[PDB]
């Protein structure tokens, strides 16, 4: 019903990536980092969401809950606190 979502990895803008790198202590950034970072993020996010949806489908739900995400992150060894 909503507009079809396409190409939203580009929504992760160069300034957003620069801010993340600055919190990571980075002072200077090759022009090629932005696309590399987009690729890495997409893989990470895909993998987490794949498992979250597997939990959602196991529970016979149409709604991904925060717990589905927490469980997916735990199953990937990236435990997250604060959403239980």
């Amino acid at each position: 019903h909503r507009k079809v979502l396409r190409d939203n990895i580009q929504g992760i803008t160069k300034p957003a990536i620069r801010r993340l790198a600055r919190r990571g202590g980075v002072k200077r950034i090759s022009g090629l980092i932005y696309e590399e970072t987009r690729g890495v993020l997409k893989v990470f996010l895909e993998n987490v969401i794949r498992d979250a949806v597997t939990y959602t489908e196991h529970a016979k739900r149409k709604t991904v809950t925060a717990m589905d995400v927490v469980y997916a992150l735990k199953r990937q060894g990236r435990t997250l606190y604060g959403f239980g």
Partner: protein
């Protein structure tokens, strides 16, 4: 009367101080949400999300990427550079065991 200009790197260092002091999320929220819904819908049509599920995804993604830029920076310094490059990201991910 020449307009004031900071030297290259001065503002970058101030930005490091600033973002390392604060804790707010650094990716815009609605575009992150569109990304999450796009990927998820490619696994399973007509899914809904609790808003806290999206926020948990953003917190985990940003912590992951900040940690990865820390390691990447260690690799760039190891090669006597101050500039991170794709090969730094790839070395850090290789030693982390990521694909």
């Amino acid at each position: 009367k020449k307009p004031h200009r900071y030297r290259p790197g001065t503002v970058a260092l101030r930005e490091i101080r600033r973002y390392q002091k604060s804790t707010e999320l650094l990716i815009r929220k609605l575009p992150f949400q569109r990304l999450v819904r796009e990927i998820a819908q490619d696994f399973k049509t007509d899914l809904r999300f609790q808003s806290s599920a999206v926020m948990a995804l953003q917190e985990a993604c940003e912590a992951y990427l900040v940690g990865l830029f820390e390691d990447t920076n260690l690799c760039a310094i190891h090669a006597k550079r101050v500039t991170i490059m794709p090969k730094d990201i790839q070395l850090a991910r290789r030693i982390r065991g990521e694909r």
